[PDB]
Each structure stands twice: as C-alpha cells, then as structure tokens.
Amino acid sequence: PQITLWKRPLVTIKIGGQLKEALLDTGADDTVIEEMSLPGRWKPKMIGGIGGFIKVRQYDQIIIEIAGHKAIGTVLVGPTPANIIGRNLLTQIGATLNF
Amino acid sequence: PQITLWKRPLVTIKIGGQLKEALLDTGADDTVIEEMSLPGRWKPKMIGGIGGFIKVRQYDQIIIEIAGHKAIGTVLVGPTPANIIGRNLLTQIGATLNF
Numbered sequence: 001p002q003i004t005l006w007k008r009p010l011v012t013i014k015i016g017g018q019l020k021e022a023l024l025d026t027g028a029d030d031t032v033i034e035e036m037s038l039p040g041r042w043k044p045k046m047i048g049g050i051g052g053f054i055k056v057r058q059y060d061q062i063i064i065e066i067a068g069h070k071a072i073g074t075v076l077v078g079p080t081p082a083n084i085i086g087r088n089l090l091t092q093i094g095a096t097l098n099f
Numbered sequence: 100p101q102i103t104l105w106k107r108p109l110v111t112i113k114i115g116g117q118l119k120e121a122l123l124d125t126g127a128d129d130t131v132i133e134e135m136s137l138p139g140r141w142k143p144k145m146i147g148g149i150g151g152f153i154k155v156r157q158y159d160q161i162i163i164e165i166a167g168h169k170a171i172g173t174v175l176v177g178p179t180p181a182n183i184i185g186r187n188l189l190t191q192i193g194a195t196l197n198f
C-alpha cells in the first residue's frame with residue numbers, strides 16, 4: 001500500500017498471537033513495543049529519544065506480522081509511550097519513502 | 100526520489116538561511132530542530148518522546164526547503180538530540196510510505 005501522512009501511520013501488528021496497534025516510524029532505527037511477555041532470553045539495551053533514554057529488553061528472532069506482512073527480527077520491549085515499528089522491520093516488509 | 104530504509108533517511112534542509120541535516124520521520128507529528136534563531140513570534144510547548152518531554156519554542160509559518168522541495172509550516176526549536184522533519188512538513192512535499 002501507499003500510506004499518506006496526513007494522519008499518524010498506524011497499522012495493526014500481530015505478536016504473540018495478539019493484535020496491537022503500532023506506528024510505522026522511519027525515524028526509529030529499532031522496533032520498540034509496550035510491556036508484554038515474549039519467549040526466550042533477553043539482552044539489555046538503552047535507547048534514546050526526545051526527552052532522554054530508557055532501558056528496554058531486547059528479544060531477537062521474534063515472529064511479528066506488520067500490516068499483513070510477515071517479519072522475523074529484533075523487538076525491544078519497555079516503557080515506550082507508543083508501539084513503534086522501526087527500520088529494522090520496515091526493511092523486512094519492503095517499505096520505502098517516496099516523494 | 101525513492102528512499103530505502105537500510106540507513107537513516109537523512110536529507111539536507113535549508114531553514115532560516117542555514118543548512119542542516121535532518122531525519123525524514125514518519126513517527127513524528129511535528130518538525131523539531133536544534134537551537135537556532137527564527138523570525139517572528141513564538142509560544143512555548145512541551146513535546147514528548149522516548150525518555151519524556153522537552154520544552155521547545157513553536158514558530159509558525161516557517162519556510163523550509165527539504166531535499167530541494169519547499170514547504171511551509173510550524174517548526175519547534177529546542178534541545179532535541181536529532182533534527183526531525185515530521186508529518187506536518189512531510190505531507191507538504193508529497194511524501195508517502197510504500198510497501
């Protein structure tokens with residue numbers, strides 16, 4: 001699809017068998033999701049934005065569907081104000097910016 | 100152009116007679132630039148992100164040239180760790196996300 005930017009580019013994702021809403025975010029290197037449970041071991045990461053850094057849990061090789069497109073990759077979990085799909089998964093679904 | 104997302108989508112902008120590098124950021128409602136002078140009146144605003152909020156100056160009706168494409172709109176100025184072109188200006192240059 002072609003997503004215009006007059007509104008927030010919110011899509012439905014599926015992770016852990018559950019549907020959630022998330023923002024397609026070209027300004028995010030990484031994908032960050034609100035607190036949830038994911039399987040396996042995690043590694044620490046600190047990520048930074050407007051307002052400062054937060055600590056998150058890094059889970060690798062997680063199966064995630066993004067707007068109906070299948071991806072498998074790294075998901076950071078922590079106290080983000082928004083679920084954001086960053087470039088590590090936008091590249092897996094073949095997304096580009098065009099003007 | 101078509102911009103892939105393997106790397107950060109950084110572009111050159113011209114704002115207030117200055118050249119800057121900025122990120123094309125579909126996850127940002129608003130355009131946020133590091134400290135600089137702009138003409139006209141302004142009003143204070145708090146904007147959030149990962150890590151919390153920062154205080155910025157909101158300037159309206161600012162002309163920006165983004166990778167060669169001119170646009171007018173609101174610019175927030177303050178202690179952002181990255182110059183960000185948000186949706187308020189991305190719409191004006193006709194940018195879409197495609198997959």
Ligand SMILES: COc1ccc(S(=O)(=O)N(CC(C)C)C[C@@H](O)[C@H](Cc2ccccc2)NC(=O)O[C@H]2CO[C@H]3O[C@@H]4OCC[C@@H]4[C@H]32)cc1
Nearest residue numbers: 027028029030048049081082126127128129147148149181
């Ligand atoms: C290493 O991997 C990362 C590292 C950092 C980030 S991030 O979330 O800090 N961010 C990086 C960017 C600031 C350089 C991604 C942005 O797209 C965030 C994404 C974001 C969205 C919502 C809340 C937090 C973050 N947007 C954001 O800060 O927008 C600001 C400006 O306009 C407003 O719109 C947004 O909605 C209203 C609040 C924000 C305001 C993500 C993944």
Ligand SMILES: [Cl-]
Nearest residue numbers: 099100166167
């Ligand atoms: Cl062109």
